[PDB]
């Protein structure tokens, strides 16, 4: 009945956010979402969306005719030009999406690290990494203490004596 964070698995139960906290203390197990990192990621993704929505003001008119076919020579020149251009946009679209998606995925991982790194820096010398995305806290952390971490009001100085004692022996 253990818990684990990122690094081989996500949380299908986290349904009110993208990134979040999951803890276990004497009061039991709990899971809450982090707002700041979630919104930051959402802001960046929608940012891409709006960018790809930016319409063009370039108007194009008919250059040939599908009722009465134009002359062969100029007609083949036109088809050759359009097909060439189509090849170009198809390539651009394929590359754009592939490139964007690679970045969307990476910046998502990036946000996860930043959150993990922030929590690590809050806990100072009062905790150790378990290697599953979790921290082993070497003191009593009731639900109020866990909440103090989630809102960045955890004062490690308060727990430092009790923690280092339990860590050393």
């Amino acid at each position: 009945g253990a818990i684990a964070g990122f690094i081989e698995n996500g949380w299908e139960g986290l349904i009110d956010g993208w990134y979040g906290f999951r803890h276990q203390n004497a009061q039991g197990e709990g899971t809450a979402a982090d707002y700041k990192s979630t919104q930051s990621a959402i802001d960046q993704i929608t940012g891409k969306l709006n960018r790809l929505i930016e319409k063009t003001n370039q108007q194009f008119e008919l250059i040939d005719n599908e009722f009465n076919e134009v002359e062969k020579q100029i007609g083949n020149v036109i088809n050759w030009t359009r097909d060439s251009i189509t090849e170009v946009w198809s390539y651009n679209a394929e590359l754009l999406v592939a490139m964007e998606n690679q970045h969307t995925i990476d910046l998502a991982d990036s946000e996860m690290d930043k959150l993990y790194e922030r929590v690590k820096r809050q806990l100072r010398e009062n905790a150790e990494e378990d290697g599953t995305g979790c921290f082993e806290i070497f003191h009593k952390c009731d639900d109020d203490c866990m909440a103090s971490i989630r809102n960045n009001t955890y004062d490690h100085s308060k727990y430092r004596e009790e923690a280092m004692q339990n860590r050393i022996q």
Partner: protein, 318 residues
């Protein structure tokens, strides 16, 4: 006591592509390539003409089919496959260039050219241009000798464009089924039509000869056109086989022309069209029609290109 950092995930994962992986699951994705078509012409906010049987070039010469459109006005112009520029069998020279011009004309304003004739019939008519009875193009005058086989006098008519915009001038050469018929209409001898401007100079000769019967007729009237610069003049020297214009055309402003085979809708508002309907989309790309016109997303070969809108989906360890 223990606190873990994590990210959400689903069982409802959707695959996308990246630089490295093909089919990597993300939490959420959206489509970037439109395939959803509206099989109507969304004409709301746009003055629209459905020419129907009236060919676009027919709006200038004026066969019966185009009588309603002789001075039309539009923001959107719709050509139909059943359209025809012709009653008496024939075709324009440089037809497509002319169509491209009229598609963005915003419509046409006609003006009398004021030609007068003497010792000549101008009541040239045909069964093919039936308007009640036998008739002819509405903006043109089919000129004959006077009786039959009679000599057609040499003539020279001119017209100046006293307006600030170029004038669409259209005339026709008639090609009789036989020299026997050409003689019956305009008299014997070789026939020449000359057309002079100040940036244009051409010459025209009838080519009488047997041809297949179109609408029961083996004769052809091929049309020719030029644009007359402001304050410039055109001059028509001829001695028969000439289809004279009665009026000149002036472009009204700006429009867009399309060819389509679907109905119009005045409730929907669109700006990108193809022959099969209207494309309304905020997506950057489309896979409906390469020849789509107006303001459209770029055409691509692919039917689908999913854009990741969520992180990589990593299943929870059960």
């Amino acid at each position: 006591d223990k606190i873990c950092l994590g990210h959400h995930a689903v069982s409802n994962g959707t695959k996308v592509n990246t630089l490295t992986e093909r089919g990597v699951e993300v939490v959420n994705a959206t489509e970037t390539v439109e395939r959803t078509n509206i099989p109507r012409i969304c004409s709301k906010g746009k003055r629209t003409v459905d020419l129907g049987q009236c060919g676009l070039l027919g709006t200038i010469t004026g066969p019966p089919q185009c009588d309603q459109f002789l001075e039309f006005s539009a923001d959107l112009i719709i050509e139909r496959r059943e359209g025809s520029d012709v009653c008496y069998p024939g075709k324009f020279v440089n037809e497509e260039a002319l169509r491209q011009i009229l598609r963005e004309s915003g419509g046409i304003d006609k003006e009398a050219m004021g030609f007068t004739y003497s010792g000549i019939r101008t009541n040239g008519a045909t069964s093919a241009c039936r308007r009640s009875g036998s008739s002819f193009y509405a903006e043109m005058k089919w000129l004959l000798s006077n009786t039959d086989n009679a000599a057609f006098p040499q003539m020279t008519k001119s017209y100046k464009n006293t307006r600030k915009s170029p004038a669409l001038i259209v005339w026709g050469i008639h090609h009789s089924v036989s020299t026997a018929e050409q003689t019956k209409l305009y008299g014997s001898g070789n026939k020449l039509v000359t057309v002079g401007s100040s940036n244009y100079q051409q010459s025209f000769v009838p080519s009488p000869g047997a041809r297949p019967q179109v609408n029961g007729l083996s004769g052809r009237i091929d049309f020719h056109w030029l644009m007359l610069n402001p304050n410039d003049t055109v001059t028509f020297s001829f001695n028969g086989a000439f289809i004279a214009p009665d009026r000149a055309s002036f472009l009204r402003g700006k429009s867009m022309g399309i060819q389509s085979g679907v109905q119009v809708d005045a409730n929907c508002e669109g700006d990108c069209y193809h022959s099969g309907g209207t494309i309304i989309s905020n997506l950057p790309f489309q896979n409906i029609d390469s020849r789509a016109v107006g303001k459209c997303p770029r055409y691509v070969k692919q039917r689908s290109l999913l854009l990741a809108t969520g992180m990589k989906n990593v299943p929870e360890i059960p």
